Symmetry: D3
Subunit: 267 residues, 6 copies
């Protein structure tokens, strides 16, 4: 590189030649992905359309759900325990619609997901057991995201993808037979303000809304009156970026760009 003349030239050579980065078809070779959600419903709301397209292409999609959804009701006669048991069933039914056959429930309490080594170890045991080719999680840099379970899921997902590759990290996994997580897998962040890869979900939008409504405890009619237009407006926001009606947006970067990189806004 010592002979390239300008930063602009170096950036393009680094991104395309050295890091081999392009977003033409980033999920192309995937056989198994994890979709990590803060609460029951986040995978389908954030990326339901893409989940169905992945299942249709013969990719095995597996959820990891960080919390139980215990707090998500204003009904005073429904305890958190009873809601959590109801929402496990809602998510099973929603997942069947999208082709998902396996969900890891971590069972942290809703509004209480910790931000700790302990939670990275839980994600790391699943990464190491399943060895996915790709991991989806919320973008923890989304502006004004006020829910701590969402920010923490996104930070702990990215951290655990990196650290789970390290054999001195949670080393008792390796002592019981698991290998470090394989290198070469992608991360794609949903619920992002800065998507650089859009999936067109226009003909899948009605199925995605149906699979969201199956979470009935969350979406009774009065709430749906505000949420349906909200969810459609979000999908148009992403779809407009590639000139289709409804889209799901993801942010994808080279691994090196998640650290010390001062020009992440160029992609």
């Amino acid at each position: 590189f010592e002979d390239i003349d300008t930063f602009e030239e170096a950036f393009n050579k680094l991104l395309r030649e050295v890091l081999e980065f392009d977003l033409q078809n980033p999920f192309k070779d995937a056989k198994k992905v994890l979709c990590i959600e803060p609460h029951p419903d986040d995978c389908v709301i954030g990326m339901g359309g893409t989940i169905k397209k992945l299942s249709d292409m013969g990719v095995e999609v597996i959820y990891v759900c960080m919390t139980d959804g215990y707090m998500g009701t204003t009904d005073e006669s429904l305890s958190g325990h009873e809601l959590a048991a109801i929402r496990r069933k809602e998510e099973e039914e929603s997942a069947r619609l999208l082709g998902v056959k396996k969900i890891y429930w971590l069972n942290y309490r809703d509004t209480e997901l910790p931000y700790s080594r302990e939670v990275r170890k839980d994600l790391t045991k699943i990464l190491r057991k399943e060895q996915p080719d790709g991991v989806f999680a919320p973008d923890p840099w989304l502006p004004y995201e006020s829910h701590p379970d969402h920010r923490r899921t996104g930070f702990l997902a990215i951290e655990s993808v990196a650290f789970s590759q390290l054999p001195n990290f949670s080393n008792t996994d390796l002592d019981i037979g698991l290998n470090p997580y394989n290198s070469g897998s992608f991360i794609a962040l949903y619920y992002t303000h800065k998507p650089n890869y859009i999936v067109d979900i226009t003909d899948l939008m009605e199925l995605k809304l149906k699979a969201i409504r199956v979470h009935r405890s969350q979406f009774p009619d009065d709430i749906w009156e505000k949420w349906e237009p909200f969810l459609r407006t979000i999908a148009m926001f992403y779809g407009e970026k590639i000139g289709v009606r409804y889209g799901e947006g993801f942010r994808i970067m080279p691994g090196l760009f998640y650290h010390i990189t001062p020009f992440t806004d160029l992609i």
Copy 2:
């Protein structure tokens, strides 16, 4: 929303009709507001002119002060305990000047406010008892905001406004006779770099400055030589956005926008 043509129209309808968002007169209907401050003096510094305006208009303003200002001196003759007691009296005088009669002191130690469910439960107990129409708090996304008590108070306030509405959150409150928070019409964030509502305080600026200086332990003459110009320049930065000499800046968004929203920069 199935029929709408473009994202731009869906966004406009979402805001004006579905969410009925209006920045013309957001504090129009308030009768009781909480002003949440990290330290003794932040309510008057960030929003003292607006507090006066509100109290003058018949609005009951009630302070919640998260910490005791124990660390706020370079005077080696003044212990933290003695400074805290001094600052309680400074805040009482300062508040009297604006029209404020009630202060909840949570008494966390300055520089040590936790980011935790315990602190959410304290805010939640106050929200359920007082049932305010509005809540004001620092914007935890202010760039370069290096005081963890400021960032934490902002996140905790937004979080508690949300979760105090959920009956399974901090449930022992309901068990002792409190009801879920269900009065608020708004959150407004002060100390913000992205205000979208500006209150003109140009004729109240002298009183604001007087009410800040009531905090004498914080503003001896030598410190005031820097702070008076800084505070004036801040008030000019905000006032200039609506073409007035001195202003106070707030950011206000629809409740939905604090979660999963990728177009928050459009307001």
Copy 3:
């Protein structure tokens, strides 16, 4: 400031006369600086060319390394204890090339640096012993920075530089004979997306790359094939800003701008 007419004027006078803010020779008169790094290798990667220039000028540069680099290997036969001991000797060799004669090792475990009062106390005790004229640390607001040890080192460095000046903070230090940290000193943040000060390291770039590669455990040939072009590109991003081939970028602000300031993007 009561009579100044525009925000733009007020701002220019606040910086240049009230705060005497200087981006022309910010490191002039520095006799002793601390360079706070999350891991062994971060001071040289982020700012090695500047550390050499400071050393060449007769400035005493002292490192504070937050963690031990225990996790930084994918070799299943190298334990973290063994890798930590390797990395300590690699940092000693790297530091000697750049003229650095002292390193404070805090010895927190890599990937496990706490965000706590305790860690501020450790920094504060060094600040009070050494009384440096300036401190360098990572910018904890770097977008997409996904290493918690980086974000937490930046926050805790900026917090400790402020709180170590307060006699009621970590008061047992003063009880054992240390004085509060002196008030004259700068902070400069490296690993930043918003530099406002660039040091030309075009001549020094090969010395920097050499001193980085002395951390051999971190940079075997396959990793260096990606990291050398990456580090050159980052240096060209900064260099271009002052018309030179390779630079190191820092963000420097007056102390007041690290709190409640809505116009930090104007510098």
Copy 4:
């Protein structure tokens, strides 16, 4: 006291005259008591007989149950959420048998009860709201007690009885209208190895076993084969101390004896 000749004389004068202590009929005047249990079933197993006798004497008995019992099954098809909802109903049915009409569920997860200020604040809000005349909890000094929820419930119960009297402790309770907890109430510790007050439960034993078996999720037939003889042997252990067939044991001391006291073994 300065004229008493021997320690033995002083101890007896202190205990009987100064502290007015005797265990002739310690629950005699009680109108309202709290029975604080670590898990659903502990009140009935530890003190079911006495609870029924208190209800029969017209005392209002109120449970506080610290945890949800989420972990207490070996059935792999029953989630913790579903078990917790089942055990809420078991405890309601068990309590009806004993005359208990009110239970405060704190909702901490089984095996996860924290030992923290936060949990003392929850107990303190209930003490301050209910103003009981007496509080029962597990003796946290029971030798070989291996369950951390049991030790922590006993320590946090004693602590919260003391601290809830202090108006600077959890002061926001007082700001919303609650008074400090009234002085003069007793504490009695059950599950104790050093009882000094025994309640004869001989004719209540069959009712107590019935009210224990209503917790069916805990006591299927195979478990009951070991637990019935266990529970009978425990009751004989306590009953033998006063010469009856089945007893429930409590340890009761003067308040001063819970602190700095080197002769607690004399009672």
Copy 5:
């Protein structure tokens, strides 16, 4: 048990018939045991003679070492990382002398073992994978035991033996293919003041001492001048209880006795 006359008879039947407790030959049937130590060297110090006896009898003994022994030197030339690596090799040699081939190193830092659910999950993962017949651990009730790593390891081991049997505890273990712990027949506590089973090690004492001294960083000659007499006197204290020169003492109780039991002193 309805018919039994006296507590004494109920106690005897409970122990011998209901609980089938026998201290004649408690390690009779073991094929695989875990020896859980706080630090490198505690298994050989507390129970090295018994470990040899077990390995000689065909029993597979597997160490779990909670911490890395990082603090265990007064040699200012030896960093914590270098000492840990030295102690791993000392333990491997020491273990080879007894018949031990496998060591799980959890790698918590010496003096810093947490008391937490995270540590329980590590022990739990090992218990579910190895399914040992017995577990040995320090007695956390040893009086005057001032090392928190010793108290914590004892409590955590007893707790994890229990909770690892519950499918909702650490559930992601089951999800990755592990089964609940359901093999153990026993816990035995060493380092105990209340042993009720004594192994004669009189002919193994020389080898025990040799295997302890293999930990050379811990036992240079000057320290050995005190430790050899202390270790010999300990072995005499235990051996004397069964009339032998040198012994090792264990406390063993029925599983029920670790909970709510008020007569644990009767064994």
Copy 6:
């Protein structure tokens, strides 16, 4: 010791010759001691007469007070900050009567003293600065001691006296010029149920009661009506053990007996 014949012999030689343990004049040669108290008033209540005797002998006695006594009032008009500042002056007056000229205030909040590494670091830094010949602290094994600040002060004092001697513990202390705590020094535990050393305070009892009552905020007349007889009775419990009317009791053991020792009750 290979040839010694009975345990009893081995023990007597271990104490008297190997450990040179002396209960005859344990405080002889002490030039400087630290007296570690949980709250303002505990050094004088537990050991005020001994502190006077040490002072009279020309020993430099230095207090370390862990907490600020913020919670110790039932007066609803006295804030904790105001009470802390009162108690600091009450301790200064009390200490002057007993010849104490220096107090380290750690300023943790009463009822909130952490049990952590951080608090050990604070004690360690004082131990290393002052290098005392002996340390006094409460016995954290006192039965029924229900104040967490008492139990945690005792544990952390004993832990810090041991760990402050290790150069890898809190190593930044040595980096700033402090040496490891010297190895010659005693621990003596007050507030103990198992004293083995008693100081006769019969002459000093009125001075002790006076110096306790200088803590007026703690001892108004109604409280003193119970506390004076209680403190006299405690002193008579200790005194009787050496045939005097009033004493202070301490538990003193060789360093080794605070770890792994099953016969601590033999002294």
